[model samples]
Target: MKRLTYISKFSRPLSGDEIEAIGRISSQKNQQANVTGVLLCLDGIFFQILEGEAEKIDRIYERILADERHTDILCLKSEVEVQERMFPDWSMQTINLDENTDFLIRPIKVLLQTLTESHRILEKYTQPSIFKIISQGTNPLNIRPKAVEKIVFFSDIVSFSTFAEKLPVEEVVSVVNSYFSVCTAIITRQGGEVTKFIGDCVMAYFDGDCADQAIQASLDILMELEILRNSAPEGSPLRVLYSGIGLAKGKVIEGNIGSELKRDYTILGDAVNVAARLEALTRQLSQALVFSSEVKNSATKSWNFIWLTDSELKGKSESIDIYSIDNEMTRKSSGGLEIARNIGHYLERV
Candidate 1:
């Protein structure tokens, strides 16, 4: 006996009806193949676990690899000798990964005969108080005012499309998850809040006196990635990460912009747009960090940067001066002497 586990991202977002259709179709096929597995779909990504004979597992995964509906299929873990199955009683289980931010849900398919069982499974996976599907009938207008000045930060992995095309899906998932986890932790520790993860990039905001911390977080991530690549074991597929970071400071509006049933808390305004454009601009100009003049002028201490002519940026309406940080060409020296001298000792741990 063998078990196979995999995760994949859909080529595009799927509607609820599309998801239900796929689940129904998959379960029917699974029953025929004598396979038992669980499928969890969230935010257009799928995670599946399959248990059965090696021959069947291989065939099913191969068919999935050729399936156009899903792209970047990653085998999270492959099969090994096992006496028992994980989901022995179920032929094909399905779950939705759309609960609260903190939950890692594992829901079972809702069937007429096992509706109560499915509800029990859902309760076992997620706290009922924190995770509840917003019924459309009870949809209430939800709005909150947010008028605050803060720092907007954005970052992206360079050559991400190329990497997705060439690398194994598992490796791509590992690297991206690793990057996101580490950077998200740093952002939280620095008093910044991550608003959302846009594919391989991170969008975060820092309010009040946390502006300097946001810049520090960016540099720390860049330095840590360098350290990770350099320290990677021999024959490792861990490629060096090239990231572009952008920061802007200005007043912005924040609110739940979607319908009551489906909404996300997000920040918007010129600052957010400018930060995104700056991050995109970094790739064009081959700069590591490109920030708005607002971010540059508000710095608490001296940092090496060169002013860019307003014409260099393309996405803004009003003329805007940008600054490209004098990004370090080489890795920092031992004992932190170089960074200590240049950007001060604040980045000693980085």
Candidate 2:
């Protein structure tokens, strides 16, 4: 079974009558269509967990989207199912009014807790975490290392959809491959390895053990991608405008997991999350890249950056200062740096 979680926002908050109307309609529709899921109204938002065959669920989603009450629909999580039919308690959906933040849940999902040491949060955290998910998938690529003091960076081109639209299907794939190939080659040449690619983005680790190497990989990826942009097609005004970079250091649990019968490699830890988060916010600003202070301090080279005064990000309680990576065009001529920096550098060691 596949699960789709959607959070809906309404222009005007949901009224009591309106909520009841929605519930009545949803219950009636589920009986008619044989849809299995859960829906509830919380804080003026309707949250639902839908499970079924993809085709049927998709067709039903189109119907839900057509309802004007739904807006800013966010599909939070979607992956192949592991647990048995979970939302089966409800024919269509259930009310977890207890899931509201009117003073309730913002603290819980952020931490592994429920209002009352409830079984809900336990079921949540017991599942393989996101870090575990990414780590396992990237193991085959021989990336995701197990070392400390290593620099990690992530990069992704901005507005790829616009580029993809103008090109033919084959052309779009070709363009994405070309950019990724260049990045992978450069990182490999610098003694760094790319963990995986998410859409147009790449998360790379340098030196595997040296902070300096991570900085170099981060810096060079920026410079090389900029070069690719400068030399674009003649009539192409849509330059691959932005690329993001994030750097961090930490000890990661890198390993292979699956049935003992068939194992897939992966890396799991928080360092990877920090790097990806920094990359995500790059588009909101002009800099094309964002980095946690952890990355800025790890770099031996000097680069211009702007620090933002924001509270710690989501999933994090405390405030974390972040710096933007604006000028990726500079080159740092550090010492003679050509050597495999770590014994377990590649996936072969694991």
Candidate 3:
């Protein structure tokens, strides 16, 4: 019912055996899905044609795009309705034009002849010399960083150093692992990505419209920590595991950065710094969660936020409004009574 065509460069060179294995696996999967296609590899470029139901083709194409072995995927044709499949008899027949230049012309001639037969139907979709496009390679400008608005979230354990100092290595590892598991689960469930975990801190972000989810995840994180603490026996190091969370909404640049040998896909911007600063402010404010006015304004649901103060954050010239939420649930959470007592001891020591 539909035909999709695309080309992508191989991320790395594949040996003959590896290519055969890939083709074999792909053929089996295609047959199971009732899809038919042709795969051709020439000059490190992969040209593929898939014919199936529209939804099935879309689903399969998504998997191919996400495959790490492929990069710079360019869709030559998509979602074009056809009276009949062009390659219904071939369930992913693969041709390796890279093996011999003499054989390359034969396969290309046959492929072109097949396309020429459907010239009327594919006139609009067909391009002149797809091989030329692939030979040129991907443009460097296509990978540049882009800025997008997001709701940034940052959280870390309170007095983590002190807790680690007083506990055994095994206990410290167990507690930190437990804490990370809890946060990761909640953040993922709320449709947020945990980008990095720096020691006791977690850095995450949600789409701009996901303020409600981000706020809910932060609250659930605190509640889960409370549950973990309560489940532990009295005088356990887990009891001292309290977390401070911060949320900020602003634009951030997202992309890959680093030297050629070492690169990282991450985000950076003022919003990220603000979120970290807000998390740190939780210690001075004696609150479990501290968030900027931007987050409060962006959230869709109403929250009982207690206005804290207009404070000048580090590296900021102007003061920003900060707020916190205090309710029966939050009062009984891990950062409630326990954190206050810990802060008292910390202050006395200082």
Candidate 4:
């Protein structure tokens, strides 16, 4: 016997009745074929696992590929020999996560608890980069460093120390979580992969061609921070919180780098440093967003980039041109005249 797992996105929005019908028919068909499996539909995405004779599984999968209801099919696991079926009694147990939320709560909770205990389902929660690596059947231990061009994104909370010192530990944790939640949502929505969060900073990357998306994400983050600040209750720490972002694009080394006991799939390169430095310089430059010439050149969107001076960055021989966008929130918080004066002073010093 063999087991197979796959995920697919619905081609169009599906009504609850239509989805229920699909589940019913799939169950009947699978039972006739002597196959057992479980299906989960959530957020317009379908996740399924099939266990049966190798040939029977292949035949059913072929039909699934031909189905017009779903697209962007990706086989996470295929034809792996198994000692016995995990869902032996379930010909096709379907879980409709979108409908009847209140009634499904108990079942959903039980299903999640059971899934978490199973090693097979744990793969669904892996990091995006690591998920891509292992999905291709590559042994992580044998993987070597690879050079790939990507757009690096870095951001951090402004005056994070003040929040840490003034607020209680629980409130401080809430503040950090709020920042991370907004950043992660915007980054992933823009098709960027969040690698990790370091202290109050967020580190992420996107494809080299995604400079425009990266820049848009940074702008959105600043705008969202302002919204959050405005909606916060009086005397709340969140009202005073602000974020600085940096973007750079260049070749980076992607690899699993760490000791045997622990491993992290991370990217390394000069671009990463450049992005980090630009984020730090945001405070000095009096801007919420700062980026390099590389990001500016790569971006196809028409953005009014205010040229800040060509400043010397650490670990670089030649000074590089720095730029920031004219944002309402930034201008309101830090006066435009003050920014110009700071730039003027920086130019004179350089």
Which residue pairs collide in model 1, if any? none
List the candidate numbers ranked by lDDT, top first: 4, 3, 1, 2
The segments of candidate 2 whose C-alpha lies over 4 angstroms from its true place after superposition are 1-149, 207-209, 236-238, 258-264, 325-350
TM-score of 3: 0.60
Name the regions of candidate 4 deviating beyond 4 angstroms.
Answer: 1-26, 29-48, 51-126, 335-350
Q: Taking the tens digit of each residue's C-alpha lDDT, what string does model 4 give over 75-166?
A: 77655657888999999988887664577486875675465345334544456556565665776767889999999999987767666666
**lDDT tens digits by residue: candidate 3, 21-97:** 87898899999988999998765667899998888888998998889987867766665557788888888999886
lDDT of 3: 0.78
Q: Per-candidate TM vs. native? A: 0.53, 0.47, 0.60, 0.68
Q: Per-residue lDDT of 1-350 in model 2, one digit per residue for the tens? A: 55676666665766667676777787777666555677766455567887766676778778888888777565555645536777665667556463555556556544433332343343343323343444234323345445444567777765565555555677567767777877777777777767677788887775444555665666676677667667877533323434556666666666655585655354566778877776666555555456677766766666666676662466643546887544524222111111112211211222
Alpha-carbon deviation at 176 in model 4, angstroms: 0.6
Please, what's the RMSD in Å of model 3? 11.6
Candidate that scores best on lDDT: 4
In candidate 3, how many clashes are counted? 0
The clash count for each model shown is 0, 9, 0, 0
- Selected candidate, larger TM-score, 1 vs 3: 3
